[PDB]
Amino acid sequence: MLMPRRMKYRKQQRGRLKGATKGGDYVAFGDYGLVALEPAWITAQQIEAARVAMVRHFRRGGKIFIRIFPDKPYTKKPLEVRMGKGKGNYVAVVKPGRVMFEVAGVTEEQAMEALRIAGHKLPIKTKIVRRDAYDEAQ
Amino acid sequence: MEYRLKAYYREGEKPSALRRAGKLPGVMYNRHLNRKVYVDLVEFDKVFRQASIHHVIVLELPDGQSLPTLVRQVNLDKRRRRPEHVDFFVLSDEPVEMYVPLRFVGTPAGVRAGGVLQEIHRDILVKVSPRNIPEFIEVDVSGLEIGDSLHASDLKLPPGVELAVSPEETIAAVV
Amino acid sequence: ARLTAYERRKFRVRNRIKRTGRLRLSVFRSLKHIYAQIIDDEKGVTLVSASSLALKLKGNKTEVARQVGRALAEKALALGIKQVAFDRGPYKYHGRVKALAEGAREGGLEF
Amino acid sequence: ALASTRNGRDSQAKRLGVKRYEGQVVRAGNILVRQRGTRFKPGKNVGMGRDFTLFALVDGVVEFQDRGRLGRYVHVRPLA
RNA sequence: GCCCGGAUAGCUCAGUCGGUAGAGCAGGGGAUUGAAAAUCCCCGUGUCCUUGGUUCGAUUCCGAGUCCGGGCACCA
RNA sequence: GCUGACUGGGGCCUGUAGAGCACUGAUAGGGCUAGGGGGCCCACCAGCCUACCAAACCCUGUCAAACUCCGAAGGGUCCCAGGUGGAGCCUGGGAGUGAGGGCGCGAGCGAUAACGUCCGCGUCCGAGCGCGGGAACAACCGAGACCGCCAGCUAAGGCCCCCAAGUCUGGGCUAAGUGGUAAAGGAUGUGGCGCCGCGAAGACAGCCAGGAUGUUGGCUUAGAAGCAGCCAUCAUUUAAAGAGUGCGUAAUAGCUCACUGGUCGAGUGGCGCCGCGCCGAAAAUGAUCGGGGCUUAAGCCCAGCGCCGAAGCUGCGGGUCUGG
RNA sequence: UCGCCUCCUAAAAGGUAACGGAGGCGCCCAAAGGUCCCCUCAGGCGGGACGGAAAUCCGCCGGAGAGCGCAAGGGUAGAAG
RNA sequence: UCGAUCAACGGAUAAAAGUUACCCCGGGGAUAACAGGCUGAUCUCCCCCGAGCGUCCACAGCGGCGGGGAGGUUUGGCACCUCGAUGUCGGCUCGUCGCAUCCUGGGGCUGAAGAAGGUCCCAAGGGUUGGGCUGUUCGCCCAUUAAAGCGGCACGCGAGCU
RNA sequence: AAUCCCCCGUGCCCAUAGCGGCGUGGAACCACCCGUUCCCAUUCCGAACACGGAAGUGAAACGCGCCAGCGCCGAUGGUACUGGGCGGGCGACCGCCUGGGAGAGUAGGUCGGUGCGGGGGA
Ligand SMILES: [Mg+2]
Ligand SMILES: [Mg+2]
Ligand SMILES: [Mg+2]
Ligand SMILES: [Mg+2]
Ligand SMILES: [Mg+2]
Ligand SMILES: [Mg+2]
Ligand SMILES: [Mg+2]
Ligand SMILES: [Mg+2]
Ligand SMILES: [Mg+2]
Ligand SMILES: [Mg+2]
Ligand SMILES: [Mg+2]
Ligand SMILES: [Mg+2]
Ligand SMILES: [Mg+2]
Ligand SMILES: [Mg+2]
Ligand SMILES: [Mg+2]
Ligand SMILES: [Mg+2]
Ligand SMILES: [Mg+2]
Ligand SMILES: [Mg+2]
Ligand SMILES: [Mg+2]
Ligand SMILES: [Mg+2]
Ligand SMILES: [Mg+2]
Ligand SMILES: [Mg+2]
Ligand SMILES: [Mg+2]
Ligand SMILES: [Mg+2]
Ligand SMILES: [Mg+2]
Ligand SMILES: [Mg+2]
Ligand SMILES: [Mg+2]
Ligand SMILES: [Mg+2]
Ligand SMILES: [Mg+2]
Ligand SMILES: [Mg+2]
Ligand SMILES: [Mg+2]
Ligand SMILES: [Mg+2]
Ligand SMILES: [Mg+2]
Ligand SMILES: [Mg+2]
Ligand SMILES: [Mg+2]
Ligand SMILES: [Mg+2]
Ligand SMILES: [Mg+2]
Ligand SMILES: [Mg+2]
Ligand SMILES: [Mg+2]
Ligand SMILES: [Mg+2]
Ligand SMILES: [Mg+2]
Ligand SMILES: [Mg+2]
Ligand SMILES: [Mg+2]
Ligand SMILES: [Mg+2]
Ligand SMILES: [Mg+2]
Ligand SMILES: [Mg+2]
Ligand SMILES: [Mg+2]
Ligand SMILES: [Mg+2]
Ligand SMILES: [Mg+2]
Ligand SMILES: [Mg+2]
Ligand SMILES: [Mg+2]
Ligand SMILES: [Mg+2]
Ligand SMILES: [Mg+2]
Ligand SMILES: [Mg+2]
Ligand SMILES: [Mg+2]
Ligand SMILES: [Mg+2]
Ligand SMILES: [Mg+2]
Ligand SMILES: [Mg+2]
Ligand SMILES: [Mg+2]
Ligand SMILES: [Mg+2]
Ligand SMILES: [Mg+2]
Ligand SMILES: [Mg+2]
Ligand SMILES: [Mg+2]
Ligand SMILES: [Mg+2]
Ligand SMILES: [Mg+2]
Ligand SMILES: [Mg+2]
Ligand SMILES: [Mg+2]
Ligand SMILES: [Mg+2]
Ligand SMILES: [Mg+2]
Ligand SMILES: [Mg+2]
Ligand SMILES: [Mg+2]
Ligand SMILES: [Mg+2]
Ligand SMILES: [Mg+2]
Ligand SMILES: [Mg+2]
Ligand SMILES: [Mg+2]
Ligand SMILES: [Mg+2]
Ligand SMILES: [Mg+2]
Ligand SMILES: [Mg+2]
Ligand SMILES: [Mg+2]
Ligand SMILES: [Mg+2]
Ligand SMILES: [Mg+2]
Ligand SMILES: [Mg+2]
Ligand SMILES: [Mg+2]
Ligand SMILES: [Mg+2]
Ligand SMILES: [Mg+2]
Ligand SMILES: [Mg+2]
Ligand SMILES: [Mg+2]
Ligand SMILES: [Mg+2]
Ligand SMILES: [Mg+2]
Ligand SMILES: [Mg+2]
Ligand SMILES: [Mg+2]
Ligand SMILES: [Mg+2]
Ligand SMILES: [Mg+2]
Ligand SMILES: [Mg+2]
Ligand SMILES: [Mg+2]
Ligand SMILES: [Mg+2]
Ligand SMILES: [Mg+2]
Ligand SMILES: [Mg+2]
Ligand SMILES: [Mg+2]
Ligand SMILES: [Mg+2]
């Protein structure tokens, strides 16, 4: 689905969405990227919604990178009220300026119209990008 | 093929202002120098899209000297993804490490049209005497078959100068 | 293998001695000679010295040693030094090292 | 168990740490540092009790010493 | 309307080592017998409930949507 | 009886924010490789191929309250100075309190719900439901009310009328009554900054003008001879029409475009950015930005100058306590 | 659920709540105690009868990832093993 | 020096469980049940995207996976006025409003020949039946109908009735 | 005697002293080395520790150099965060002032420095 195997701890505190993406952010694997303009918990099921929209969009062809991963467990109570925490029930924290997704090996006009679909499945505003000198060398 | 920009100096003059000003803070340095400079953003941009830490940029700037720089850093701030500052490395004649682009030459040359092409590096890091700087590298290897990993020194090595290696890594492959 | 047995026991016995905080009567012994050097730490400083080298004596290495002890006491006691602690370094207290130490009383002592 | 709550414990805080800082005047007996491992070793005129606890041996002032991979050190300088 | 299950030749029901679906019970033929029944052999048809996905590959892994079985919530 | 909060200098203590991946774990893409998933040649040790399993290892790329190779701002404490304060310390007499709340910041629980809940540091209400602003309103802004005054200056907020003071001066924006409101998402609204393609070898708009050959394309067919259909979409002859984009359809007749000449005559089409706006936009008694009303403003952004404005500050007089 | 220990929450002093997230104790040892002396791990690769992923042996590499009676933390081979 | 799961672990007694719709007093809106309020997970309705089904396909009619909201009618969360009292479901009577429209009026599109439908837009003037069953609200069913609309008003309305 | 250089001790800074490669040293120091009678040793072994030695060797170790492949250290500039002071946003969050200011990374650095004492040369 997308999810770790093996966790150290089952549940973990919410924390803030403060700041800028802190890495990720420079477009390392592909010809075109999708970058986050807003912070959000992006869900294993939103990610896979986007991934499939793109493969469906081209031919089973192309190449797709993803590059954000849902390692943060997301609890919810049932309709109860208050005794303990839990349960269940996975997100990836995503700050502004991060490259998620990022396709390659496809025509610009394909990638861009697929990346546009892809971001319609996301809770945040997004930006399509290309690739650069600015994405350096390393 | 050959590139120059401009450059100016600065001492005080807070970066935020300069950056509001259409200009682009940066620094000039090398073993014998370190100096505070700025440039025009819109000007710099056009050049850097081209040069891109691959070709040499000769600056200009007042005095007027004209200084043979390699760009060795660009900090783009992550929110707007747009350069906030630039490192300009000035050459002198002592060997210096750097990034050379890569010319992949051929047809798929076996399993042609085709397997999958898979270029694993658009660059290589190489120690080079500034004087002779091999502005690209033709790499063909018409052997070019399914599954292999070409290492390093199997590259042309345009005449001037040696790898900054590692000699064993992954350049391309077909599958 | 890092940091040998020799250098462990070396450190081991020094450290213990160095806590009590007396002057240190340190003993080097080569296969040929035996030297002894009385140190004050925290000044990192040597005060009295005695060697089978600078005394140029020979024959029966143990008996040679008893002498460089008396040699040390005598020179040392002359500066006021009476109490110290026997370093014994990385050497079993025995034989040549024992002998220098029991030759180092008659003079400053407790060994 | 799992749900109701299996958690809920914690122990009392141990009020651990440094109790005298550099150049504070102390007297024989004053404990200088309260600590779990050997996180500071005893220095000049400084004892260590069985719970790893460091005290002044003599009246004086406390100096701190960072000896690199020899760890950190607390001494008391007399003029007691 | 809600959370959970089941669809497999002709009917009944298997089938987690992801990697070539078999056993019965029908049906046809054989051995058996005086002829059958029983019993033993042997036989074939599921494009294996549609559709997106993973995977080189899914009836065998995932998630929905259906035709149909279970447990669920009007109000004082 | 100078030691106080606060402040300056100096030392020491620390492991948060940020960041990092060296540890513990998680983790995307690739490489190289143990064991095998066994395709199998075995069914002798063999045994090779792996677009599946895979440790470690290299490369790229990330994540963590209970990870840290790192690590600020600040915070604590001691010394030395300033600091005479309804400050400080010592002994003793009298209490009351031990339901707190809002808000800001930092966390947890909760649903990145609650005028939710629980801690931390601040504040204010409590007890300042006294005063001014916010239409009205404990805790938001302003400000700490001893008494009096038909005197002055200011704070916040204001200066078109209700309503005290500008229908004040300059520059730009907006045509929705936006202002006077609510998102994804959308859109030749409108104004600026920019970049890219095409264009007086005369482009974009129109208009005048050509509207393929072998050939039905081989396929398929009563026929698709592009348009009821799956396609060798290939040789040619041209300044120049795809065996044909669409209406047509008794397959063909008739028809249009692409793609070209030509007429004219200066810009045209694409992208990105910022400002203001527009759609998205459905609730229950009678409506409304507090109201009237406002459109080069009485709205929004920029610069300015006056003024109005409190129990704050001043001026004058008085009261009481404390000090001298 | 109620006392005790470890970690986090805990906002880099101490301290700090919740029917917040996770675990442990109610023992044990006459040696697992005192001292003196000596010795140094785990792991990996290579070699070696029965010996196999591992018994024991030999080589090299291995600053601590092992050990320290039991949870966790801190500490620790210049020993606390 | 010993006897403590005095473990509700600062340890009332050496010695102790239940029930009350037969109940009582003192208090509390410090605290539950009703209603309101905040909230809006859940619920109802929109909207974005647009795999896909629809012979072909402009989405005629559908619409996966995901995304953003509106409303405040549900079930809840919270515990804020009210416990020196805010009478609770349902019916009846009497209405009034909202519009997310059931009918009638006017529209666009259609996979609209006509007639008849489908879907969406405008529109709140008026209308919106009678019965069997159950306390029922709902719902099912009979017979009709232009239709047999969904909500709010303390789940409107007990100093109006039952 | 000071000064310098080499060795031997022994401190200190705590990797800029480390790993690896290379080279170099025996007169003197030092080590390995000769032996196991004696003191003293090995859960077996003079391996180690110990003694009595002095024929040989700088092979090992140690010391001294030189190499930047690794390791270690590491600016300046710019950001992040932030004391204090202000704004903006339904929210999540964001910006301005003033003061402090990393981490990663880039440039470079580095094959140590040094105190006391001896022995020997100066
Ligand atoms: Mg990074
Ligand atoms: Mg969520
Ligand atoms: Mg409850
Ligand atoms: Mg979006
Ligand atoms: Mg604790
Ligand atoms: Mg027969
Ligand atoms: Mg028969
Ligand atoms: Mg004073
Ligand atoms: Mg201080
Ligand atoms: Mg963090
Ligand atoms: Mg890691
Ligand atoms: Mg942390
Ligand atoms: Mg550092
Ligand atoms: Mg003072
Ligand atoms: Mg007082
Ligand atoms: Mg008192
Ligand atoms: Mg109480
Ligand atoms: Mg209380
Ligand atoms: Mg409280
Ligand atoms: Mg704020
Ligand atoms: Mg509250
Ligand atoms: Mg709140
Ligand atoms: Mg408060
Ligand atoms: Mg009160
Ligand atoms: Mg007050
Ligand atoms: Mg009032
Ligand atoms: Mg007021
Ligand atoms: Mg008022
Ligand atoms: Mg008011
Ligand atoms: Mg007030
Ligand atoms: Mg007053
Ligand atoms: Mg007004
Ligand atoms: Mg007026
Ligand atoms: Mg005017
Ligand atoms: Mg208006
Ligand atoms: Mg309005
Ligand atoms: Mg104007
Ligand atoms: Mg103004
Ligand atoms: Mg005035
Ligand atoms: Mg007066
Ligand atoms: Mg007074
Ligand atoms: Mg910790
Ligand atoms: Mg703390
Ligand atoms: Mg703190
Ligand atoms: Mg603290
Ligand atoms: Mg327990
Ligand atoms: Mg081993
Ligand atoms: Mg082995
Ligand atoms: Mg350990
Ligand atoms: Mg432990
Ligand atoms: Mg342990
Ligand atoms: Mg530990
Ligand atoms: Mg109790
Ligand atoms: Mg108690
Ligand atoms: Mg207690
Ligand atoms: Mg009792
Ligand atoms: Mg009773
Ligand atoms: Mg009864
Ligand atoms: Mg009775
Ligand atoms: Mg009674
Ligand atoms: Mg009563
Ligand atoms: Mg009611
Ligand atoms: Mg209620
Ligand atoms: Mg009420
Ligand atoms: Mg809502
Ligand atoms: Mg709402
Ligand atoms: Mg809508
Ligand atoms: Mg409610
Ligand atoms: Mg209440
Ligand atoms: Mg409360
Ligand atoms: Mg009541
Ligand atoms: Mg009353
Ligand atoms: Mg009604
Ligand atoms: Mg309507
Ligand atoms: Mg109608
Ligand atoms: Mg009609
Ligand atoms: Mg119609
Ligand atoms: Mg009709
Ligand atoms: Mg009507
Ligand atoms: Mg009506
Ligand atoms: Mg009847
Ligand atoms: Mg009835
Ligand atoms: Mg019913
Ligand atoms: Mg009826
Ligand atoms: Mg209700
Ligand atoms: Mg009612
Ligand atoms: Mg009544
Ligand atoms: Mg009444
Ligand atoms: Mg009434
Ligand atoms: Mg270090
Ligand atoms: Mg020699
Ligand atoms: Mg010689
Ligand atoms: Mg040698
Ligand atoms: Mg650095
Ligand atoms: Mg800096
Ligand atoms: Mg600040
Ligand atoms: Mg730095
Ligand atoms: Mg080095
Ligand atoms: Mg030295
Ligand atoms: Mg000398």
Tab-separated table of N, CA and C (backbone and C1' of nucleotides) in Angstrom, chain I residues 84-113:
chain	number	residue	atom	x	y	z
I	84	G	P	12.020	36.670	24.537
I	84	G	O5'	12.248	38.184	24.101
I	84	G	C5'	12.637	39.197	25.010
I	84	G	C4'	12.906	40.487	24.279
I	84	G	C3'	11.744	41.070	23.507
I	84	G	O3'	10.744	41.666	24.319
I	84	G	C1'	13.698	41.206	22.186
I	85	G	P	9.195	41.618	23.878
I	85	G	O5'	9.048	42.677	22.692
I	85	G	C5'	9.638	43.954	22.805
I	85	G	C4'	9.678	44.677	21.491
I	85	G	C3'	8.390	44.727	20.715
I	85	G	O3'	7.451	45.626	21.254
I	85	G	C1'	10.179	44.314	19.234
I	86	C	P	5.888	45.261	21.118
I	86	C	O5'	5.595	45.778	19.638
I	86	C	C5'	4.907	44.964	18.703
I	86	C	C4'	5.121	45.444	17.286
I	86	C	C3'	4.048	45.010	16.297
I	86	C	O3'	2.915	45.849	16.339
I	86	C	C1'	6.155	44.492	15.403
I	87	G	P	1.457	45.248	16.083
I	87	G	O5'	1.286	45.329	14.520
I	87	G	C5'	0.681	44.263	13.825
I	87	G	C4'	1.274	44.145	12.452
I	87	G	C3'	0.540	43.197	11.538
I	87	G	O3'	-0.638	43.778	11.018
I	87	G	C1'	2.841	42.738	11.424
I	88	G	P	-2.049	43.060	11.301
I	88	G	O5'	-2.026	41.938	10.176
I	88	G	C5'	-1.536	42.304	8.891
I	88	G	C4'	-1.263	41.116	8.025
I	88	G	C3'	-2.313	40.027	8.063
I	88	G	O3'	-3.488	40.320	7.324
I	88	G	C1'	-0.189	39.051	8.223
I	89	G	P	-4.863	39.600	7.740
I	89	G	O5'	-4.553	38.054	7.515
I	89	G	C5'	-4.683	37.493	6.222
I	89	G	C4'	-4.415	36.015	6.239
I	89	G	C3'	-5.455	35.145	6.911
I	89	G	O3'	-6.616	34.942	6.124
I	89	G	C1'	-3.304	34.473	7.597
I	90	C	P	-8.078	35.117	6.786
I	90	C	O5'	-8.118	33.988	7.919
I	90	C	C5'	-8.904	34.146	9.094
I	90	C	C4'	-9.494	32.830	9.514
I	90	C	C3'	-8.491	31.796	9.960
I	90	C	O3'	-8.029	32.012	11.284
I	90	C	C1'	-10.004	30.803	8.455
I	91	G	P	-6.449	32.135	11.540
I	91	G	O5'	-5.946	30.697	11.113
I	91	G	C5'	-6.205	29.630	12.001
I	91	G	C4'	-6.287	28.315	11.291
I	91	G	C3'	-4.952	27.669	11.013
I	91	G	O3'	-4.489	26.977	12.139
I	91	G	C1'	-6.266	27.621	9.062
I	92	A	P	-3.060	27.350	12.730
I	92	A	O5'	-2.119	26.323	11.970
I	92	A	C5'	-2.538	24.971	11.847
I	92	A	C4'	-1.943	24.303	10.644
I	92	A	C3'	-0.492	24.632	10.366
I	92	A	O3'	0.389	23.825	11.124
I	92	A	C1'	-1.739	24.891	8.395
I	93	C	P	1.759	24.439	11.704
I	93	C	O5'	2.587	24.808	10.382
I	93	C	C5'	3.350	26.004	10.275
I	93	C	C4'	2.911	26.822	9.090
I	93	C	C3'	3.714	28.084	8.817
I	93	C	O3'	4.917	27.860	8.101
I	93	C	C1'	1.424	28.611	8.780
I	94	C	P	6.256	28.591	8.597
I	94	C	O5'	6.172	30.016	7.861
I	94	C	C5'	5.863	30.102	6.477
I	94	C	C4'	5.351	31.466	6.039
I	94	C	C3'	6.220	32.692	6.332
I	94	C	O3'	7.265	32.856	5.384
I	94	C	C1'	3.962	33.166	6.901
I	95	G	P	8.769	33.281	5.795
I	95	G	O5'	8.634	34.855	6.015
I	95	G	C5'	8.756	35.740	4.907
I	95	G	C4'	8.057	37.060	5.118
I	95	G	C3'	8.828	38.120	5.905
I	95	G	O3'	9.737	38.866	5.120
I	95	G	C1'	6.622	37.943	6.744
I	96	C	P	11.279	39.022	5.589
I	96	C	O5'	11.308	40.444	6.322
I	96	C	C5'	10.611	41.545	5.736
I	96	C	C4'	10.364	42.694	6.690
I	96	C	C3'	11.456	42.995	7.703
I	96	C	O3'	12.527	43.746	7.169
I	96	C	C1'	9.383	42.941	8.809
I	97	C	P	14.014	43.549	7.724
I	97	C	O5'	14.017	44.318	9.120
I	97	C	C5'	13.826	45.722	9.149
I	97	C	C4'	13.642	46.250	10.545
I	97	C	C3'	14.732	45.935	11.566
I	97	C	O3'	15.862	46.781	11.491
I	97	C	C1'	12.652	45.443	12.512
I	98	U	P	17.286	46.214	11.019
I	98	U	O5'	18.220	46.344	12.295
I	98	U	C5'	18.050	47.392	13.210
I	98	U	C4'	17.971	46.847	14.603
I	98	U	C3'	18.941	45.737	14.968
I	98	U	O3'	20.259	46.160	15.196
I	98	U	C1'	16.810	45.217	15.804
I	99	G	P	21.477	45.422	14.460
I	99	G	O5'	21.988	44.323	15.499
I	99	G	C5'	22.350	44.723	16.807
I	99	G	C4'	22.071	43.666	17.837
I	99	G	C3'	22.636	42.285	17.548
I	99	G	O3'	24.029	42.135	17.759
I	99	G	C1'	20.399	42.072	18.259
I	100	G	P	24.921	41.349	16.652
I	100	G	O5'	24.924	39.828	17.122
I	100	G	C5'	25.128	39.504	18.482
I	100	G	C4'	24.567	38.143	18.849
I	100	G	C3'	25.017	36.951	18.032
I	100	G	O3'	26.333	36.551	18.329
I	100	G	C1'	22.727	36.763	18.445
I	101	G	P	27.272	35.992	17.162
I	101	G	O5'	26.393	34.933	16.354
I	101	G	C5'	26.364	33.589	16.817
I	101	G	C4'	25.411	32.730	16.039
I	101	G	C3'	25.904	32.324	14.673
I	101	G	O3'	26.826	31.251	14.756
I	101	G	C1'	23.657	33.054	14.523
I	102	A	P	27.993	31.111	13.669
I	102	A	O5'	27.424	30.130	12.553
I	102	A	C5'	27.754	28.751	12.582
I	102	A	C4'	26.775	27.929	13.399
I	102	A	C3'	26.772	26.458	13.030
I	102	A	O3'	27.743	25.780	13.797
I	102	A	C1'	24.531	27.281	13.109
I	103	G	P	28.719	24.726	13.129
I	103	G	O5'	27.779	23.694	12.352
I	103	G	C5'	27.115	22.649	13.057
I	103	G	C4'	26.096	21.937	12.204
I	103	G	C3'	26.596	21.426	10.893
I	103	G	O3'	27.392	20.287	11.036
I	103	G	C1'	24.503	22.385	10.567
I	104	A	P	28.591	20.077	10.008
I	104	A	O5'	27.833	19.806	8.632
I	104	A	C5'	27.241	18.547	8.363
I	104	A	C4'	26.454	18.581	7.079
I	104	A	C3'	27.255	18.785	5.802
I	104	A	O3'	27.807	17.596	5.264
I	104	A	C1'	25.558	20.355	5.868
I	105	G	P	29.333	17.630	4.806
I	105	G	O5'	29.334	18.763	3.692
I	105	G	C5'	28.617	18.575	2.490
I	105	G	C4'	28.615	19.828	1.661
I	105	G	C3'	29.975	20.337	1.240
I	105	G	O3'	30.492	19.628	0.132
I	105	G	C1'	28.709	22.131	2.076
I	106	U	P	32.080	19.519	-0.138
I	106	U	O5'	32.497	20.992	-0.578
I	106	U	C5'	31.937	21.567	-1.742
I	106	U	C4'	32.391	22.992	-1.949
I	106	U	C3'	33.887	23.325	-1.846
I	106	U	O3'	34.683	22.955	-2.967
I	106	U	C1'	32.671	24.929	-0.664
I	107	A	P	36.209	22.470	-2.784
I	107	A	O5'	36.964	23.771	-2.243
I	107	A	C5'	37.068	24.910	-3.084
I	107	A	C4'	37.755	26.082	-2.421
I	107	A	C3'	39.169	25.866	-1.893
I	107	A	O3'	40.161	25.881	-2.913
I	107	A	C1'	37.881	27.092	-0.309
I	108	G	P	41.283	24.720	-3.044
I	108	G	O5'	41.678	24.335	-1.543
I	108	G	C5'	43.004	24.487	-1.050
I	108	G	C4'	43.055	25.297	0.234
I	108	G	C3'	43.793	24.625	1.390
I	108	G	O3'	45.205	24.796	1.324
I	108	G	C1'	41.670	25.366	2.156
I	109	G	P	46.250	23.563	1.523
I	109	G	O5'	46.408	23.428	3.100
I	109	G	C5'	46.354	24.585	3.931
I	109	G	C4'	46.097	24.194	5.355
I	109	G	C3'	46.893	22.981	5.820
I	109	G	O3'	48.196	23.278	6.267
I	109	G	C1'	44.629	22.663	6.332
I	110	U	P	49.387	22.453	5.600
I	110	U	O5'	49.660	21.243	6.600
I	110	U	C5'	49.208	21.334	7.939
I	110	U	C4'	48.682	20.029	8.451
I	110	U	C3'	49.491	18.801	8.136
I	110	U	O3'	50.674	18.747	8.901
I	110	U	C1'	47.171	18.317	8.026
I	111	C	P	52.015	18.110	8.290
I	111	C	O5'	51.779	16.526	8.295
I	111	C	C5'	51.888	15.811	9.512
I	111	C	C4'	52.021	14.327	9.323
I	111	C	C3'	53.402	13.799	8.885
I	111	C	O3'	53.873	12.797	9.781
I	111	C	C1'	51.655	12.763	7.671
I	112	G	P	54.867	13.231	10.950
I	112	G	O5'	54.210	14.590	11.469
I	112	G	C5'	54.643	15.209	12.664
I	112	G	C4'	53.754	16.366	13.019
I	112	G	C3'	54.256	17.245	14.146
I	112	G	O3'	55.273	18.150	13.757
I	112	G	C1'	52.007	16.705	14.566
I	113	G	P	56.610	18.292	14.650
I	113	G	O5'	56.225	19.418	15.707
I	113	G	C5'	55.510	20.578	15.293
I	113	G	C4'	54.710	21.176	16.429
I	113	G	C3'	55.462	21.401	17.735
I	113	G	O3'	56.302	22.555	17.752
I	113	G	C1'	53.416	20.322	18.209
